[PDB]
Design an enzyme around this catalytic site. Sequence first.
Site, PDB file in Angstrom:
ATOM      1  N   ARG A  48     -47.706 -31.894  36.868  1.00 35.44           N
ATOM      2  CA  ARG A  48     -48.428 -32.935  36.154  1.00 35.44           C
ATOM      3  C   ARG A  48     -49.942 -32.801  36.385  1.00 35.44           C
ATOM      4  O   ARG A  48     -50.742 -33.009  35.465  1.00 35.44           O
ATOM      5  CB  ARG A  48     -47.948 -34.323  36.592  1.00 35.44           C
ATOM      6  CG  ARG A  48     -48.558 -35.461  35.795  1.00 35.44           C
ATOM      7  CD  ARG A  48     -48.232 -36.798  36.420  1.00 35.44           C
ATOM      8  NE  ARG A  48     -49.061 -37.862  35.868  1.00 35.44           N
ATOM      9  CZ  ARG A  48     -49.640 -38.821  36.588  1.00 35.44           C
ATOM     10  NH1 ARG A  48     -49.490 -38.864  37.909  1.00 35.44           N
ATOM     11  NH2 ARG A  48     -50.394 -39.726  35.985  1.00 35.44           N
ATOM     12  N   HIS A  52     -52.284 -32.714  33.378  1.00 34.29           N
ATOM     13  CA  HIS A  52     -53.338 -33.701  33.205  1.00 34.29           C
ATOM     14  C   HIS A  52     -54.740 -33.160  33.367  1.00 34.29           C
ATOM     15  O   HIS A  52     -55.672 -33.660  32.734  1.00 34.29           O
ATOM     16  CB  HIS A  52     -53.116 -34.885  34.133  1.00 34.29           C
ATOM     17  CG  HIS A  52     -52.217 -35.925  33.535  1.00 34.29           C
ATOM     18  ND1 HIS A  52     -52.495 -37.272  33.621  1.00 34.29           N
ATOM     19  CD2 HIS A  52     -51.118 -35.809  32.761  1.00 34.29           C
ATOM     20  CE1 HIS A  52     -51.609 -37.940  32.911  1.00 34.29           C
ATOM     21  NE2 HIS A  52     -50.757 -37.086  32.381  1.00 34.29           N
ATOM     22  N   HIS A 175     -40.358 -32.817  31.230  1.00 31.12           N
ATOM     23  CA  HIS A 175     -39.814 -34.074  31.724  1.00 31.12           C
ATOM     24  C   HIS A 175     -38.469 -33.871  32.418  1.00 31.12           C
ATOM     25  O   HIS A 175     -37.798 -34.830  32.789  1.00 31.12           O
ATOM     26  CB  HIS A 175     -39.719 -35.110  30.601  1.00 31.12           C
ATOM     27  CG  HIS A 175     -41.101 -35.740  30.418  1.00 31.12           C
ATOM     28  ND1 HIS A 175     -41.477 -36.540  29.358  1.00 31.12           N
ATOM     29  CD2 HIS A 175     -42.191 -35.644  31.301  1.00 31.12           C
ATOM     30  CE1 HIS A 175     -42.748 -36.914  29.580  1.00 31.12           C
ATOM     31  NE2 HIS A 175     -43.197 -36.410  30.693  1.00 31.12           N
ATOM     32  N   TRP A 191     -35.587 -38.629  34.021  1.00 33.98           N
ATOM     33  CA  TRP A 191     -35.118 -38.175  32.709  1.00 33.98           C
ATOM     34  C   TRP A 191     -33.763 -37.467  32.824  1.00 33.98           C
ATOM     35  O   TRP A 191     -32.980 -37.444  31.856  1.00 33.98           O
ATOM     36  CB  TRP A 191     -36.134 -37.222  32.064  1.00 33.98           C
ATOM     37  CG  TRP A 191     -37.431 -37.870  31.666  1.00 33.98           C
ATOM     38  CD1 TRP A 191     -37.727 -38.462  30.472  1.00 33.98           C
ATOM     39  CD2 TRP A 191     -38.629 -37.954  32.462  1.00 33.98           C
ATOM     40  NE1 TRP A 191     -39.031 -38.902  30.467  1.00 33.98           N
ATOM     41  CE2 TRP A 191     -39.602 -38.600  31.672  1.00 33.98           C
ATOM     42  CE3 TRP A 191     -38.966 -37.542  33.753  1.00 33.98           C
ATOM     43  CZ2 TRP A 191     -40.898 -38.842  32.142  1.00 33.98           C
ATOM     44  CZ3 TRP A 191     -40.253 -37.777  34.213  1.00 33.98           C
ATOM     45  CH2 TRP A 191     -41.202 -38.420  33.409  1.00 33.98           C
TER      46      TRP A 191
HETATM   47  C1  HEM Z   1     -46.922 -37.485  24.702  1.00 31.14           C
HETATM   48  C2  HEM Z   1     -46.852 -36.806  26.003  1.00 31.14           C
HETATM   49  C3  HEM Z   1     -46.575 -37.284  27.300  1.00 31.14           C
HETATM   50  C4  HEM Z   1     -46.515 -38.550  27.774  1.00 31.14           C
HETATM   51  C5  HEM Z   1     -46.818 -39.845  27.033  1.00 31.14           C
HETATM   52  C6  HEM Z   1     -46.084 -38.474  29.151  1.00 31.14           C
HETATM   53  C7  HEM Z   1     -45.871 -39.566  29.994  1.00 31.14           C
HETATM   54  C8  HEM Z   1     -45.456 -39.520  31.322  1.00 31.14           C
HETATM   55  C9  HEM Z   1     -45.308 -40.665  32.186  1.00 31.14           C
HETATM   56  C10 HEM Z   1     -45.530 -42.131  31.811  1.00 31.14           C
HETATM   57  C11 HEM Z   1     -44.960 -40.207  33.407  1.00 31.14           C
HETATM   58  C12 HEM Z   1     -44.708 -41.020  34.663  1.00 31.14           C
HETATM   59  C13 HEM Z   1     -45.871 -41.086  35.627  1.00 31.14           C
HETATM   60  C14 HEM Z   1     -45.497 -41.778  36.909  1.00 31.14           C
HETATM   61  O1  HEM Z   1     -45.179 -42.978  36.869  1.00 31.14           O
HETATM   62  O2  HEM Z   1     -45.502 -41.129  37.967  1.00 31.14           O
HETATM   63  C15 HEM Z   1     -44.873 -38.771  33.315  1.00 31.14           C
HETATM   64  C16 HEM Z   1     -44.518 -37.922  34.357  1.00 31.14           C
HETATM   65  C17 HEM Z   1     -44.440 -36.533  34.286  1.00 31.14           C
HETATM   66  N1  HEM Z   1     -44.748 -35.782  33.170  1.00 31.14           N
HETATM   67 FE1  HEM Z   1     -45.266 -36.467  31.353  1.00 31.14          FE
HETATM   68  N2  HEM Z   1     -45.913 -37.150  29.518  1.00 31.14           N
HETATM   69  C18 HEM Z   1     -46.281 -36.408  28.418  1.00 31.14           C
HETATM   70  C19 HEM Z   1     -46.333 -35.014  28.391  1.00 31.14           C
HETATM   71  C20 HEM Z   1     -46.011 -34.162  29.456  1.00 31.14           C
HETATM   72  C21 HEM Z   1     -46.236 -32.733  29.467  1.00 31.14           C
HETATM   73  C22 HEM Z   1     -46.792 -31.944  28.275  1.00 31.14           C
HETATM   74  C23 HEM Z   1     -45.953 -32.291  30.720  1.00 31.14           C
HETATM   75  C24 HEM Z   1     -46.177 -31.025  31.312  1.00 31.14           C
HETATM   76  C25 HEM Z   1     -46.004 -29.733  30.689  1.00 31.14           C
HETATM   77  C26 HEM Z   1     -45.430 -33.422  31.454  1.00 31.14           C
HETATM   78  C27 HEM Z   1     -44.985 -33.373  32.775  1.00 31.14           C
HETATM   79  C28 HEM Z   1     -44.648 -34.466  33.566  1.00 31.14           C
HETATM   80  C29 HEM Z   1     -44.045 -34.398  34.876  1.00 31.14           C
HETATM   81  C30 HEM Z   1     -43.611 -33.154  35.647  1.00 31.14           C
HETATM   82  C31 HEM Z   1     -43.896 -35.670  35.308  1.00 31.14           C
HETATM   83  C32 HEM Z   1     -43.231 -36.109  36.625  1.00 31.14           C
HETATM   84  C33 HEM Z   1     -44.275 -36.481  37.671  1.00 31.14           C
HETATM   85  C34 HEM Z   1     -43.686 -37.016  38.968  1.00 31.14           C
HETATM   86  O3  HEM Z   1     -42.447 -37.021  39.146  1.00 31.14           O
HETATM   87  O4  HEM Z   1     -44.478 -37.428  39.832  1.00 31.14           O
HETATM   88  N3  HEM Z   1     -45.559 -34.568  30.698  1.00 31.14           N
HETATM   89  N4  HEM Z   1     -45.176 -38.367  32.032  1.00 31.14           N
END
Ligand code: HEM
EC number: 1.11.1.5
Length: 294
Positions: A48, A52, A175, A191
């Site tokens: 992330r 980000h 995800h 997820w």
């Molecule tokens: C429209 C696109 C996206 C939205 C709205 C979105 C939204 C989110 C949200 C709300 C979280 C939770 C954050 C938290 O509470 O810790 C999250 C986590 C995460 N996202 Fe996304 N995401 C998007 C695209 C992506 C993309 C493109 C990647 C990477 C290639 C990605 C990888 C991750 C990963 C690995 C997590 C897990 C983080 C953790 O477990 O601490 N996301 N995302």
Amino acid sequence: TTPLVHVASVEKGRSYEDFQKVYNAIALKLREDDEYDNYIGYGPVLVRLAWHTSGTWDKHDNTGGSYGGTYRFKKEFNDPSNAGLQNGFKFLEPIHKEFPWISSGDLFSLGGVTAVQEMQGPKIPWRCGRVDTPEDTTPDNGRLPDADKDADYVRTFFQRLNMNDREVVALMGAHTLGKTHLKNSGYEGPWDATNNVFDNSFYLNLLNEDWKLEKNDANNEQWDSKSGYMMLPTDYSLIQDPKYLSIVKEYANDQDKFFKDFSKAFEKLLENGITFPKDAPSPFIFKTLEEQGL
Ligand code: HEM
Ligand SMILES: [K+]
């Protein structure tokens, strides 16, 4: 403001071996600090941080992007959209201390590549050359995506990062890692069942689970399944949109294709805004700890 050109500049005298050492350090620490986030580990948060730190890019004027490593500055570090990433940054601190020669941008991006590979994901070719830029180059908050939106929003949002439908669906597949944390984003739950294994389960769950549109304790809507999985409105939009749906089904039925497409799109995301000279070294493909017998 004339659009800046960010030319990749290899860290003085560094080659593949140097970066493989940084990769190994990250990989070894991932293995070591396995307790984090209820034994999920730091893998997910690193992917992330990588996404980000690169996702602030704007194809129009080349502002933001992975090149400058601007997340180290408070404006970006404190972006509400980055809540929770401090953990990934703290994890990388020891790594950067041991290898002070690597730029922040290269470290942030390499952390993502390492995490994906170590969590059994596809090999992601990576290029060095990002150079730290001043605090005044830090992009303003608000360039990262909202999660309470639909397919139209997702499609339009990603056009700014020069990503098409296939790239978008492939990228969202990330995800398959980690989970949403209420305190960070206002969403809660994982997820899938393998939150530290990079697999195509995200697409399978999206298609096979029985989702119910519910409200979480933060008063936000999210899709929940009896199995204990969740999907953000933005994730669910991938099966609501016909074009997205075809691709979701494709990845749900072809693990290899998903791996190959994700690898390409993730590398592209991590290199957006960077100009690699013709004499620049070819992309590095790092071996996993497992492949090295480490
Ligand atoms: C429209 C696109 C996206 C939205 C709205 C979105 C939204 C989110 C949200 C709300 C979280 C939770 C954050 C938290 O509470 O810790 C999250 C986590 C995460 N996202 Fe996304 N995401 C998007 C695209 C992506 C993309 C493109 C990647 C990477 C290639 C990605 C990888 C991750 C990963 C690995 C997590 C897990 C983080 C953790 O477990 O601490 N996301 N995302
Ligand atoms: K998974």
